[PDB]
Design a protein around this ligand. Sequence first.
Ligand SMILES: O=C(O)COc1c(C(=O)O)sc2c1sc1cc(NC3CCN(S(=O)(=O)Cc4ccccc4)CC3)ccc12
Length: 297
Amino acid sequence: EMEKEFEQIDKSGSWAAIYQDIRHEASDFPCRVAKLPKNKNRNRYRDVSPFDHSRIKLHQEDNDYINASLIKMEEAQRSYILTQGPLPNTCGHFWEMVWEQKSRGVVMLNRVMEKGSLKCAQYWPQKEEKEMIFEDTNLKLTLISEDIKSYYTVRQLELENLTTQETREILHFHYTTWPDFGVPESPASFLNFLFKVRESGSLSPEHGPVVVHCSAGIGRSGTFCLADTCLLLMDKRKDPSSVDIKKVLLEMRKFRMGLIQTADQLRFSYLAVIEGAKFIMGDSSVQDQWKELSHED
Ligand SMILES: O=C(O)COc1c(C(=O)O)sc2c1sc1cc(NC3CCN(S(=O)(=O)Cc4ccccc4)CC3)ccc12
């Protein structure tokens, strides 16, 4: 169905119309807390807000607000937290959220500078010997190691609750070559990275939801989660034909606005899912193929 649909859309060249259709149907819920005056400086973009019903609340009495949404995919049985790139004033909240939600993985799909502008704060330590303390949320963060590939880096971080002295390992997955409002180089490079996240165990139901972020937390992040959810649905039923990508996206859009930002990002999601289906249905060669085609070395 999906590969048929994909061919029928490319032929008619109607990706824009298909994408706009989803924009039209998409849920609309209030974002009243996000729009409170006291939270203006907690939002990176005026027009990108978490719905009240699905927002992550910080466990504090001062101000519980963070620009983050819990995407809870009931049928798939996987949850994601989509959030904006933290601001210089919300890095402590970002890590507070990771701690409180018991996340094991953070997926970052942007660079700190893109198109000459700063799309995200430097919210993690770049050097082992220079750890970060977030005074406001009483948290310590230390770079333990990093594994740099050509187009993505995986970092091991240690997060410490300074109140309890409890520590956890966070894995940081940083895709560095995904342009804003753009698409990955190929399905292969995208899937190579997604499977890295998967193979880390960071997506396990044993943990809290993985935190996923680019700059606004909706375009690239939306693309990432849609592809992952569709592959997981397909996997559970071992039935690629049972997956309706647009339906999955619309469901996801119940939890955060604007997920997937361009028609081509939607088109790419189809490509990645169709290609990833090969692995799901038992082709044990494609994963090595993606690794080679990704040029990660
Ligand atoms: O590929 C990417 O990751 C692109 O990421 C983005 C940016 C970046 O600099 O990286 S800026 C930006 C996005 S997405 C986005 C959306 C946006 N506004 C959208 C938000 C979603 N809506 S909606 O879901 O339709 C609800 C709505 C909100 C406001 C007005 C009208 C409707 C459409 C406008 C403004 C800036 C940005």
